[PDB]
Amino acid sequence: SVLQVLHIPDERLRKVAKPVEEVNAEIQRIVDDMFETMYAEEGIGLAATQVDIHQRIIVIDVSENRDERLVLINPELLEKSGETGIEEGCLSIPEQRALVPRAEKVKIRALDRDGKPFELEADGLLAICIQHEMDHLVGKLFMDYLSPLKQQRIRQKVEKLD
Ligand code: NI
Ligand SMILES: [S]
């Protein structure tokens, strides 16, 4: 099933996800529906918060083939270093891109789509992407990293579209 993706201004994008309790069949339907939604919208990552489910679930695909499935349930940043940043975009902030500061390298743990934990050391577009998506789970969007000015210009340009 494809899910609607919430757009700013929506208070539901500001909600703080509670952790996933038991990884099960029902949690697995959410996952595949998020993958379906993420590809359908040609996005490289998605957080349950954006589809208005408020649990700590994240699906990602940073491959250029669009065939490498990565799932982060209840993720937890253990280490990080450096700074990086690229032009980021967001399915929930339609057609707005800006550069945002990020840690270069991240090291997270999380449970996978079967409920089994894994540790992951990341850099490049994955590190940027893990950070961007975990921000969604705690009510934070990437435009928050910018002067109030650019933040108003961004909401204005998103009013019009929708
Ligand atoms: Ni986003
Ligand atoms: S996103």
Swiss-Prot record:
The active site is at E133. One of its GO terms (molecular function) is hydrolase activity. One of its GO terms (biological process) is translation. Keywords: Hydrolase, Iron, Metal-binding, Protein biosynthesis, Zinc. Monomer. HAMAP family: Pep_deformylase (MF_00163). Its cofactor is Fe(2+); Zn(2+). Belongs to the polypeptide deformylase family. Disulfide bonds: none annotated. Inhibited by 1,10-phenanthroline. Upon overproduction is isolated with 1 Fe(2+) ion per monomer, a Ni(2+)-bound form is as active while a Zn(2+)-bound form is inactive. One of its GO terms (cellular component) is cytosol. This is Peptide deformylase. The gene is def. Removes the formyl group from the N-terminal Met of newly synthesized proteins. Requires at least a dipeptide for an efficient rate of reaction. N-terminal L-methionine is a prerequisite for activity but the enzyme has broad specificity at other positions.
